[PDB]
Amino acid sequence: TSDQENALEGMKAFCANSLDKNWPAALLQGYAGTGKTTLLGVLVSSLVEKGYKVAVTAPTNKAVSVLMEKVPDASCHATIHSLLGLAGTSCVNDFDVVIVDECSMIGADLLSMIRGRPKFIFVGDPAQLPPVNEIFSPVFRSVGLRWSLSKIVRGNAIIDLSAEIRLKSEEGVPMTLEDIKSILEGKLEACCLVSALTHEWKEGRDSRILAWRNATVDFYNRAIFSSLYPDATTPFVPGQTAIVDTSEEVTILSLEFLARVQRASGETWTLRHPWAMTVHKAQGSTYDTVFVDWNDLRAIPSDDFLRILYTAVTRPSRYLAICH
Amino acid sequence: TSDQENALEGMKAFCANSLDKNWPAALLQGYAGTGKTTLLGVLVSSLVEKGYKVAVTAPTNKAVSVLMEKVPDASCHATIHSLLGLAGTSCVNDFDVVIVDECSMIGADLLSMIRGRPKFIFVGDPAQLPPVNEIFSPVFRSVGLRWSLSKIVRGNAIIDLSAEIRLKSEEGVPMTLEDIKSILEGKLEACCLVSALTHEWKEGRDSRILAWRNATVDFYNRAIFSSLYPDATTPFVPGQTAIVDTSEEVTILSLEFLARVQRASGETWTLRHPWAMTVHKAQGSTYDTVFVDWNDLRAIPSDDFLRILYTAVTRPSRYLAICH
């Protein structure tokens, strides 16, 4: 690869203090289909082989949960709040290299309290949404070392649609459903809901709908709750997966204004459906195969488009479907 | 070079339509001492040798005047307002490649009316000041192709001070005059005013002082006017160089509420001293050897520092001096 190895060779030397010292920063800036989360495996493998103490970190629990499968050579997979005790005790000084991930939603306060003795590396995508009440992630305003990856390298349709969306974003012509149909013809990786994903859930596979909030994702969740379990005697059902750490999926083991929440894998404890949801809560978390409701994203927004569509087309891992 | 050739190979192919089409954008993002204005010579030479019709453009007349010496192989060195007739006639369609320069001060309106049939390439530095009433240049928010250069490659002191300023910018420790003295000891490329640069002007060399405005650059200009010409019979003197196109130096040939302004080189016509000036008006324009008044930049600003100091240390070409 052209950009990938250039970005790697130089981070692999900035970590080893080959460059000038007192630089506690870096950047990657990959778009999609680039090794924005692929070259990190090689980097972490090399650093562990070098004898360092690396930590792979993410702002959300779902992102680091994915990273566990993506990066099986790190040491302290944790949330950004758990490596510094921000909200137990800060364990950051025990590490030599910190590799932050999905930094596109990282707020300014995280940069303010990201200080530490190890070398911090940031990974993000400038084409995704910025954090709430904030227009462009401050990590991209980094004045120190920088790197950039702008390709779609490696017969695919999940990322080709995102590339087309980005292409139409930099020029004035908008993107309308006829363009979607004309680009999604023959690829057959898109189907350009309630019963379909209910049948999916009967088989076991779980999906989601990337609609807006406060008006759609409750009507698009109560229907699935009624259809999947015909009898509704309790707000939840044993064996169901639930949502709220932050934005972490939990299992349900029993009930009773009382409930039970099996957290993590084996951690049972005591104390939001996972089907209908919003693109904002989707940022950073893949949620596997997902369906996209075009009639919601096209209707209300008029300026954020081509950026809401991005970060919504990149969520699915193998199957995407747009419904009109 | 590592980053330079990677940035070149890829622009040299995006221009030739080797990549995907309908991408009317690019980026370079060099800091200082990088080939942010050096690899452009090679690029333009290759494109002219390829048979294209390239145009080297800048938002200010001083920047393109410098580019004429830096780039002697272009075809239509002009202001950004002259290649599109924004304010005669737009000549942009006659060109195949447009290479914009010093894009760090380019406003959003320039991106809005930058549309055209040729392929537009943007060059800028994220570490410099943003355009007025605007926090971060929209060109860096480009979603299309991107490139980055972050080095100080190629016993020098004019850019080493800027590198140190940037290094102190990304961490919480500020930079104070004792640090300036400790870094500027033995380098002897800095002297860490009125009489000194008046003696400079008697010899012929002209310098400047990068102070603030509305309070300092008038007292720091009237004194030089009185000292350089002991008798003050007219606001200007024949043979003097003057300032205000926009931010373009002109000569004075005669006077008479009447005057004469020899514009350009040979263009005589009819109708701000060049000594004391502001860092804002300094952006993009080198103004050769310059002196920097530390007591002005240190006193009033408290947040913009390390960014006002940048774009003020990079203005001089061969000699820098800081006075306290």
Q: What is the DSSP string of B182-223?
A: HHSSS--SS---HHHHHHHHHHT----EEE-SSSSTTHHHHH
Kindly report the number of other CB atoms within 10 A of residue A77's CB atom: 17
Residue of B168, B196, B169 lying closest to B293 (CA atoms): B196
> Do A294 and A170 belong together in one domain?
yes
Mutation to test the A interface, candidates B141, B148, B303, most A Cβ within 10 Å: B148
In a domain, B149, yes or no: no
> Do B123 and B246 belong together in one domain?
no
Residue numbers of the domain that contains A216: 158-323
Structure-block tokens of residue B122? 């943007």
Residue of A282, A287, A289 lying closest to A312 (CA atoms): A282
Residue of A56, A145, A50, A140 lying closest to A99 (CA atoms): A56
Edge-first strand listing for the sheet containing B290-293: B276-278, B209-211, B290-293, B320-323
**Which residue in chain A has the smallest CA separation from B166?**
A143
- Spatial distance between the Cα atoms of A85 and A91, rounded to a whole number of angstroms: 8
Amino acid letter at B105?
Answer: M
Give the list of residues 6+ apart from residue B265 with CB closer than 8 angstroms, or none.
none
- CB < 8 Å to A304, chain B: none
Give the list of residues 6+ apart from residue B260 with CB closer than 8 angstroms, or none.
B252, B253, B254, B268, B269, B270, B271
Structure-block tokens of residue B264? 């350009």
> Do B123 and B164 belong together in one domain?
no
> Do B169 and B51 belong together in one domain?
no
Q: Do B2 and A6 touch (CB under 8 A)?
A: yes
What sign does the CA torsion over A286, A83, A30, A174 have?
Answer: positive
> Do B77 and B169 belong together in one domain?
no
Mutation to test the A interface, candidates B150, B168, B183, most A Cβ within 10 Å: B150
**What's the angle, vertex CA A129, arms to CA A127 and CA A134, rounded to 5?**
120
> Do A59 and A199 belong together in one domain?
no
- Spatial distance between the Cα atoms of A211 and A194, rounded to a whole number of angstroms: 13
Give the list of residues 6+ apart from residue B27 with CB closer than 8 angstroms, or none.
B122, B123, B124, B139, B140, B142, B145, B146, B147, B148
Please indicate the experimental technique that yielded this structure. Answer: cryo-EM
Residue that is last in its domain, among B90, B111, B141: B141
In a domain, B109, yes or no: yes
- Spatial distance between the Cα atoms of B127 and B111, rounded to a whole number of angstroms: 20
In a domain, B254, yes or no: yes
In a domain, B146, yes or no: no
Residue count of chain A: 324
Total number of domains in chain A: 2
Residue count of chain B: 324
In a domain, A148, yes or no: no
- CB < 8 Å to B148, chain A: 29, 146-148
Asked whether A249 and A243 are in contact (CB, 8 A), the reply is yes
> Do B181 and B136 belong together in one domain?
no
Mutation to test the B interface, candidates A143, A165, A183, most B Cβ within 10 Å: A143
Tokens 């009185």, residue located: B226
Q: What is the CATH number of the domain that holds A76?
A: 3.40.50.300
Asked whether B47 and B81 are in contact (CB, 8 A), the reply is no
> Do B284 and B226 belong together in one domain?
yes
Amino acid letter at A305?
Answer: F
CA B115 vs CA A175, A303, B83, B90, B109: distances in Å: 18, 19, 12, 11, 11
Q: Do B141 and A163 touch (CB under 8 A)?
A: no
Element (H, E) at A58: strand A54-58
Q: Report the greatest alpha carbon distance in chain A.
A: 66
Kindly report the number of other CB atoms within 10 A of residue B73's CB atom: 15
> Do B68 and B171 belong together in one domain?
no
Helices and strands, number each (H, E), in chain A: 10, 12
Min Cα–Cα distance to chain A from B129, Å? 12
> Do A100 and A51 belong together in one domain?
yes
